[PDB]
Amino acid sequence: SLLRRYLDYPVLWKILWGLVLGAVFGLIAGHFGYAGAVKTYIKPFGDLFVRLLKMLVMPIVLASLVVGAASISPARLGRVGVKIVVYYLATSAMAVFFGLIVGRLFNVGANVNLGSGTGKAIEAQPPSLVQTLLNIVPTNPFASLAKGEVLPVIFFAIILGIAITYLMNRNEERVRKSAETLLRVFDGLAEAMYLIVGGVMQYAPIGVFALIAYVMAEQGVRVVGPLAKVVGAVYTGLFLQIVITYFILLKVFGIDPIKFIRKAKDAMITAFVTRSSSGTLPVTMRVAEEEMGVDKGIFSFTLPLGATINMDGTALYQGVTVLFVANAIGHPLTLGQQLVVVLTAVLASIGTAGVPGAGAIMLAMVLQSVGLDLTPGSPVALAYAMILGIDAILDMGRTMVNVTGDLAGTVIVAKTEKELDESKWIS
Amino acid sequence: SLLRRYLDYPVLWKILWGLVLGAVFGLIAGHFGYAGAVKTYIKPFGDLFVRLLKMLVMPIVLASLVVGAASISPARLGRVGVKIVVYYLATSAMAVFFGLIVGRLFNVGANVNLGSGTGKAIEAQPPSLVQTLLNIVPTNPFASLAKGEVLPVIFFAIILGIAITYLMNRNEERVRKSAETLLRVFDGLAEAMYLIVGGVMQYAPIGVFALIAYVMAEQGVRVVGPLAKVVGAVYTGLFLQIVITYFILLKVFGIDPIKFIRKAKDAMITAFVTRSSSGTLPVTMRVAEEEMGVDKGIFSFTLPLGATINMDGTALYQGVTVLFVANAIGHPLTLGQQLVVVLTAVLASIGTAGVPGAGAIMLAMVLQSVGLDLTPGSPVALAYAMILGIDAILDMGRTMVNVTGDLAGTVIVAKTEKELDESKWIS
Amino acid sequence: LLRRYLDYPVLWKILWGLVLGAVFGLIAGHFGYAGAVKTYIKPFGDLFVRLLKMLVMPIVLASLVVGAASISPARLGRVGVKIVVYYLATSAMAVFFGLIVGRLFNVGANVNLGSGTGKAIEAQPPSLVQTLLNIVPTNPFASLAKGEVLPVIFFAIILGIAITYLMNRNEERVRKSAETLLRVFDGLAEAMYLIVGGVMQYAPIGVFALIAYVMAEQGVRVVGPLAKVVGAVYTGLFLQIVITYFILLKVFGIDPIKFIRKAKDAMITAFVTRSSSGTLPVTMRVAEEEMGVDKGIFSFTLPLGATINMDGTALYQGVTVLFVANAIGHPLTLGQQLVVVLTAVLASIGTAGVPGAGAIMLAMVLQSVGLDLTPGSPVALAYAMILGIDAILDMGRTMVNVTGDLAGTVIVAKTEKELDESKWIS
């Protein structure tokens, strides 16, 4: 059938085709003179998609974060455990930092010009940095769920997950079963949200097509050029991410980085082509075993984690594309909420979906966190539509660096613990 | 036994007693000089009742909708399943349409002097129709739970129910277990709220008596006339719905409706007398099997379901008694809300208990859905009290189409696949 | 330091942090950098206060649903009525003690803030009927998302009762569903207690900062017409600990000096952390293994009394309203002081168990008279002189908010004979 074939095409290439068809439809609707004809009939689908996607930020944040932070914690993390979780969070932070640096350096979204004048958010007195830190702990977690605050809910969710996993070890049975049932509730909620995200991203082709037809018909923006600069900035950012972060870490931890790249090439290409991080886990394991020298005790637990919480390419994408959305609507980010992006792109990666749409939802999450809202109609929705349309071209490098990150963390861990076979690094 | 005889007197027949006693007490203490004293001493009980009745709407709507959606989702509906569920939803929508039609024909609440002269004219300028349909989708489900928006919560709850059952049909045992646990959480919450609704409806005679005593002894408004109009508008609505909707909907399927009613009379009058749509399930099943000729597999699946999600009588009762409120208080309904009422009534009939007093919780929910809040002390509360008072005269009759629309759709679906042996519908 | 600061017992590592904070605030706010503790140190105190406020709504929703769902309604009614009568009696007696000590010390005596006649003579807004109605929430989620503890307490109790009715049903489906919902709420309460036990490990630094900022800014500003209120309020608290509670226990055959000797831990855990709903685990570990109260009694009367039983906030909301009305230039009326028995109790019931929640609700208990800030009425002078001295009054008046919880739980558990009388024998 037609609708049954529409749900079979690869969802990200469907979204990219939606963006392209939306751009051409808008150019035509300008070439003909039917601006209102698409602003009244084609826009409602765009607003429907924007709302249908912005609905899925708070439930995912809460449930996914609770489950993810209950999966890793000082309770069930041993010696390899904390030494790899510290590494994952540190390298995700450096990845978001490289994202923001390379965004400002490529001047992302500086020449799209779809804002609403130098205003509509005028404050002239931003909050201090220490206050921006204290605002992470919420005075009332339910009021921080209702008011749509993302970072306080992330903090409370992580704390609740750690507390539950502390409970699961207690010597009583009532507390153990209570903690198990609470974690199962949050697991069910997070996975139901992943199904609904699958459905919303199935719809997303039409949503992006509408939000691009409306913007290309109503006014004239630059969506053929700044998207090229975002692709260039993302890929140069991932290149720099590797050849700086992982190279300085390997050099400072005794490993020879040229050898690491020459051996990790197999998992890198496999994830680049296959385009999936959790689907290239066997090949990553095979490379870490037969090529690096990591023992089974270190990479039978690190890689199944580094394929779930070490999202470096996704973090750098959430850096540079947040910066594109911010410079696009004309509200550049200050050095006080350029760190909120880091915090809620590192913590929000501690629990991440594997479904197609784990970058877009997290980008909407970082947008709602840093202070830009996705209300239907605001140019934030239009710039997010352009980024979501380009998504299918960034996913490849995203997953390549995603699987190079944990493959470079396993080698470091197994070397620091003297459980790395030195015989597989020389001759 | 000082309370037990009161608590055991059949509710909905102590509510009508509360209404009549309130009317007569407001009469005898209205032209005796005690209006201030009845507002200071008696009306606080009606205030407490209105607060206790608003306390239930959000938890009951969220939990009941989630469980009902997960009960009739497309993940478990077969062929007869969809063929009967699209019927159960279309007939409820047409039933509320007939309710609005017949409630604007009789001018249900036109001769009631609630509210004030005009109040304010700025209350106009509603959002467009398509903007309402987009406002069905919530930007934040927790923010729609807090702000008391009962239609977006309905949508999110239906979505979450369908997601939870699509989970329960998954292969991974961990996620199936998590989905079962989440569904049992929502089931337990819905059942606890049904218990609380039972308690509140046990208290409701005092609340209706107090509100009626206050409104009578204060403004001596019409309570006999307009209630004799709404009881009669609802009954003409029911009669018209049977004789029009079910007759055309049986005749367009080759089923002669005359003999349909002639052989459904037994179940009809049994549900009319017993005032229970669930307590007439044995008679409904025997009359669908023997006297009508429907195969076993169909009426063993559509009657136990239709007695819970197909309420074409309370749908029409809400469609008429929300016109009653919106015409008595002095805020006539706009076409942008004569559709919110339909969607809310239809999607709220999807999960209902049948507990005596759950046809008025749906009315409170529909009121909170169109905009008319039950603000305590405001004319919406007094009009809703006058409606809830006459909940026996309406119940005896609207418990009959509730189960006529069950064996009127079972026969349709049995005919649509040749399980309805025409040896019974001949001569 | 490795695992050292995390394995020193919490009581005398919060008390030590408080002592170090007092001495540091003094020697650094009297001698050298007195404005650096506002930039570098006070933010840690703010982090601690926000962490304490984070754990009030879930700890009063879940720990009340699983509290009221563990008592059969037959005993729940009796315990609830007994404990509500007790809380209200102690509150209406604490306000009276506050009034008599505020008229005894003559608080706000040598302050003439420039008022001619003073508008504090007709201050009778409240009705108590709309107040008894506001207990019932019109929306439970909207009363959770707004930090209202009384409506959510009502809903949590009426939900625990519904659950303990459901677990006696014939349908095994609804039986299992109610048990699963009860397990969710029990797990939420237990996780909240673990989070509180983890926050009390940061509590040394938080108390250090919160008291360093005060003992640096108000190191010398507790002399003059202000010391008297700190000398009155505290005396008030002393009387409340010594006259009311003791006598109450002396009526029910419960040794008072032993009661204090046993509640020492909860007293010094609420006096330094300033929150009566963040010392709830330390109060439960005192009522169960040192007092001898059956779990069904305290598991409900402690999460309830942690918020609605404040016999110190009331005794503080009497002396301080009397002070802010005496600094205007006219004492409190003999008949107007009786509404303080009703407006400082109805404000000591909705007030949340968080630090510095007495000075905030003091604005509401002053809205009974409702004066404006700058001109003609020094209600933001004789209340800016109090908010600056709050974190000292907000330490003793939250020691009695948990001694009241413990005394009421001991009374209710001894009247119902569910108290283990093998503990008070020595």
Ligand SMILES: N[C@@H](CC(=O)O)C(=O)O
């Ligand atoms: N912090 C106090 C409340 C207050 O003083 O306002 C307590 O809960 O004990």
